[PDB]
Symmetry: C4
Subunit: 231 residues, 4 copies
Amino acid sequence: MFRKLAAECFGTFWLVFGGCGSAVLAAGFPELGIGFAGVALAFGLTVLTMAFAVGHISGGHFNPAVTIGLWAGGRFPAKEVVGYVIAQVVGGIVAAALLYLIASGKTGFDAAASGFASNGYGEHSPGGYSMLSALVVELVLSAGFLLVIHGATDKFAPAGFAPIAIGLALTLIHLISIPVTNTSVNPARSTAVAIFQGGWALEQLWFFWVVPIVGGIIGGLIYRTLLEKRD
Amino acid sequence: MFRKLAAECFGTFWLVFGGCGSAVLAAGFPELGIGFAGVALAFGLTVLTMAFAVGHISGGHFNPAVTIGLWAGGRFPAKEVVGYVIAQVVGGIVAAALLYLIASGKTGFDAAASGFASNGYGEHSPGGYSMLSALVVELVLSAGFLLVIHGATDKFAPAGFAPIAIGLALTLIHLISIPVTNTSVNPARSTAVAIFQGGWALEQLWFFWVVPIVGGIIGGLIYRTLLEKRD
Amino acid sequence: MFRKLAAECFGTFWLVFGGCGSAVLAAGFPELGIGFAGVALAFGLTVLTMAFAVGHISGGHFNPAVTIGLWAGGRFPAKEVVGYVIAQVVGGIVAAALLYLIASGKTGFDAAASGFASNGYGEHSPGGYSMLSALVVELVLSAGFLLVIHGATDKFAPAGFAPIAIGLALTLIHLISIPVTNTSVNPARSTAVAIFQGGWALEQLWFFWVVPIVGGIIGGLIYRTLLEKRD
Amino acid sequence: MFRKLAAECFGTFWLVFGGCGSAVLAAGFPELGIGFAGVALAFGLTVLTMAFAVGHISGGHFNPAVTIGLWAGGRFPAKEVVGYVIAQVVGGIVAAALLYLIASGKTGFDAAASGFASNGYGEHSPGGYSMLSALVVELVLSAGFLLVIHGATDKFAPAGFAPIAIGLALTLIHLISIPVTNTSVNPARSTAVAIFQGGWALEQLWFFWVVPIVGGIIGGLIYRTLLEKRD
Ligand SMILES: CCCCCCCCO[C@@H]1[C@@H](O)[C@H](O)[C@@H](CO)O[C@H]1O
Ligand SMILES: CCCCCCCCO[C@@H]1[C@@H](O)[C@H](O)[C@@H](CO)O[C@H]1O
Ligand SMILES: CCCCCCCCO[C@@H]1[C@@H](O)[C@H](O)[C@@H](CO)O[C@H]1O
Ligand SMILES: CCCCCCCCO[C@@H]1[C@@H](O)[C@H](O)[C@@H](CO)O[C@H]1O
Ligand SMILES: CCCCCCCCO[C@@H]1[C@@H](O)[C@H](O)[C@@H](CO)O[C@H]1O
Ligand SMILES: CCCCCCCCO[C@@H]1[C@@H](O)[C@H](O)[C@@H](CO)O[C@H]1O
Ligand SMILES: CCCCCCCCO[C@@H]1[C@@H](O)[C@H](O)[C@@H](CO)O[C@H]1O
Ligand SMILES: CCCCCCCCO[C@@H]1[C@@H](O)[C@H](O)[C@@H](CO)O[C@H]1O
Ligand SMILES: CCCCCCCCO[C@@H]1[C@@H](O)[C@H](O)[C@@H](CO)O[C@H]1O
Ligand SMILES: CCCCCCCCO[C@@H]1[C@@H](O)[C@H](O)[C@@H](CO)O[C@H]1O
Ligand SMILES: CCCCCCCCO[C@@H]1[C@@H](O)[C@H](O)[C@@H](CO)O[C@H]1O
Ligand SMILES: CCCCCCCCO[C@@H]1[C@@H](O)[C@H](O)[C@@H](CO)O[C@H]1O
Ligand SMILES: CCCCCCCCO[C@@H]1[C@@H](O)[C@H](O)[C@@H](CO)O[C@H]1O
Ligand SMILES: CCCCCCCCO[C@@H]1[C@@H](O)[C@H](O)[C@@H](CO)O[C@H]1O
Ligand SMILES: CCCCCCCCO[C@@H]1[C@@H](O)[C@H](O)[C@@H](CO)O[C@H]1O
Ligand SMILES: CCCCCCCCO[C@@H]1[C@@H](O)[C@H](O)[C@@H](CO)O[C@H]1O
């Protein structure tokens, strides 16, 4: 365990630093900016490169909703969960700190006013979507995410392909939901960035813990008590 | 069969929710929108992530044209077809419903006036292309799609790579045909979205059932009676 | 041979129809257009999906420069070359014909004036680059392309990954050279489209036969008499 | 060794010619330009296609920070390092020369004034970021890069997937850091292009040798003395 947690910490740090870093540093860059499609690719790739680099160690969760989701689907032991969830929040926060430091090297930076890539709904939704819209998309996408993780980790097809299926799945998820909640489906990622925004983000933070997790559990039971295995 | 259909339902739901969701939620977002290239990537990725997650269960069709296409090429039994085709239409429609619900959380939403990512030709073609143009591209692309599916499912090269070849093939198909018909090549996907547009989409719906299917059958016989196997 | 040629024909048709189709149908679409990055992805993906679908049959060349390049590197028999090169030109031309038909379904279409995705230099170069610039980039990129094909087909690492390495390599090649020559590195692709442009394209056609081929041969000998094998 | 160096030379040439070529030839092309997301994809793909083509020969470094990084992590012998580092700088410079020649075929070209895709900080940073910001991102990203390389080269999961994990990792790195330093994490790449810019680039060159390397060493020891192996 004194090695599987390091991978957890270093993985969620990569995800935050990369995904959110692309969001605050290059998403809106004038003319040459990467936009949502670029940030969506980044997030997915942080997971794909780390799932290949440290997946054969901790399993490549880098997400509390994924950990607690592998538990519900009956594939990840209990109490080890807490160890992962904490390492995930820490790694994300560290990354968010260095990110904030890097972004501060440019005149006019304002993590409060800009949002600092924080997830939010209603008045804090990128496309101005209602809290209902945020709940539905976040839940469905979260459920589907874990459903793909489970099927891809199943012992009947992948065989080294899981990193690609999971990483691209996260990319797809951002191509859909960024306009709604800016896309979370990962409590560790929402917390890491809400802390530095220190305002409204920290007030809706609770939402991106429950829905992502609930949805994640739903998807774990769906594949468990409805798909494969049987015998 | 009480497990292969669930995968069919959950797969076509993923495809619709994701592909069409990106189309109605983020394709045209101001400045940071993903555009056609983004929607094209999304569609392809829904198939790729689900083909890896539930392909080793149902075969990963998520498309009536693909099912009926694997039958013509002589690789998919009869009557089981009907079971798949229905599960595919249901999953798509469910997704279209939740999508409509999510999109409704934003002021000014109008599935009738916006089209709601519906396929269409002539006056309902994105680039204003004639019905002829729609027929040709939809047929050729549909035939090629199934031709790639067959070769990638062949027992002489892939070996776990089929999900990538099929998923990217669908992405490619949207990079070409969105301006023409908004890209269908999947009856289940055209129906799911035409129902909520409830106007012209439901009037041209028939077109995106026959051509996609006919073209799909053409491609299944082309690889069967012209490529590989032999012995 | 009465099966390996069909794959050749159907593959180069896919490449032209898809790569050039994205170029003339969606590259410049208003606001939502895919641009060069989109066309570059399309071209690469036509090769990747067909290399997986019909590569375990003909080897997946879909390019005269690749065929004649595998011969120089000492990996592809003679005279069979002519069989491939002809099937490649035919498949490309057929696709170019259907493409022209599809593009004609939209008011204002003009293959002569628009260029119809034709390769060219000097006054017919997208970025207005000199013939020298066209020669260098086309040669280097063509040499590198075949160098990657050879190494990826080598029996010491890939093992089913060749389609990905070759397909993405072609994508990369378009991200660099479209502004220069609109990117050719494939005689079959330049001919298929120059015929319908019927003007200047048919006058510089010769250039995109020799350089692509010469460069292709250079890369085949470089990997042969400088890399791997030895024993 | 008289074969592993050729791959080193030809690989770093590919990386420079492709990555930087896309940067100077098509990144800013009017309306249809590929932007940062396009250049980021190019760089990553040069590594991915060459890692598959000549990785089973030299190991696919194409980067002095990667070579010296595999040494610190205890996976790459000494003195052979110097052989690689030199072949890498040469290949990059050759490519930079041909690139400069190609770019010269277009009226108004000015490698001094345009920067010629050179890395830089402060007043020479694309987004105008402080030297501190440049140090942090370059170090972290460099450390993470080698951390992914090590885990992906580990003998417990990849098995032919390393090229994908490493190539996409470099893409991700550019989606984040281009606005800051224009992204280096590769001394050979910074030198190849600074020589032709011949001005400020050659004055900050030292920075993109030390930080990339230091960060690279940090990541090599992190995976070595903190992750996997054990027994
Ligand atoms: C490893 C480094 C961890 C450091 C954690 C730092 C947390 C700082 O958190 C504070 C917020 O709570 C505050 O409201 C905002 C805005 O003014 O400023 C941040 O820096
Ligand atoms: C891991 C860190 C746990 C985060 C929980 C933070 C709870 C604080 O929540 C409060 C909000 O309720 C308050 O209105 C805003 C206004 O600026 O200040 C926040 O810090
Ligand atoms: C492991 C760390 C767990 C962090 C969970 C943080 C949950 C957020 O908790 C905060 C509350 O404390 C705050 O007062 C309300 C106001 O509406 O906003 C919530 O989001
Ligand atoms: C570990 C994550 C659990 C988060 C604990 C959240 C405790 C507070 O939860 C309440 C919500 O239930 C309430 O409806 C909203 C606003 O209307 O205010 C929040 O603070
Ligand atoms: C599982 C949920 C399935 C629900 C299916 C709902 C189908 C509704 O279908 C109707 C259309 O027929 C109508 O014309 C349009 C526009 O006013 O409104 C839609 O909601
Ligand atoms: C699975 C659902 C089957 C869909 C078949 C729908 C057939 C209805 O088709 C009619 C059109 O012909 C009519 O002109 C339009 C105008 O608003 O109304 C539609 O509902
Ligand atoms: C399994 C469900 C099959 C759905 C097939 C729906 C076919 C569409 O059918 C409708 C007709 O009923 C309508 O009146 C005409 C008008 O031109 O438009 C067609 O598209
Ligand atoms: C299951 C899908 C089959 C669809 C059944 C379609 C039945 C109606 O089909 C007719 C077409 O043949 C006719 O030409 C067009 C418009 O000119 O009107 C349609 O409604
Ligand atoms: C299988 C179908 C193959 C058909 C080949 C058709 C070749 C036509 O080629 C002609 C050009 O030579 C002519 O100059 C241009 C512009 O006016 O018109 C084209 O259609
Ligand atoms: C496979 C088809 C072979 C193509 C070779 C074509 C050679 C014709 O080349 C001539 C040019 O030299 C002439 O100036 C232009 C002007 O419109 O007309 C072309 O058709
Ligand atoms: C298998 C088919 C081979 C096709 C090769 C076509 C080569 C092009 O050949 C044409 C010449 O015939 C024409 O007159 C000159 C004018 O400068 O332009 C060339 O490109
Ligand atoms: C099969 C492809 C071979 C192509 C045959 C080309 C024959 C003509 O080649 C000549 C070139 O050598 C000449 O320099 C240019 C223009 O300055 O005119 C061309 O037509
Ligand atoms: C294999 C080819 C290697 C050739 C190396 C050429 C190095 C040239 O380097 C010079 C710079 O030092 C000079 O300041 C700039 C700007 O005026 O011009 C460049 O060409
Ligand atoms: C492999 C090549 C090694 C590169 C090291 C170059 C060291 C030269 O460094 C000087 C700078 O210090 C000087 O101020 C600028 C101004 O134009 O000129 C440069 O050439
Ligand atoms: C193998 C080749 C190694 C190249 C290392 C080049 C290091 C750059 O070295 C130069 C110095 O020589 C110059 O005078 C200062 C000015 O501030 O700028 C540095 O970047
Ligand atoms: C091989 C790469 C090593 C590079 C050698 C660099 C030697 C010079 O290094 C100095 C830096 O230490 C100094 O702080 C900066 C500017 O303030 O000027 C540079 O030239």
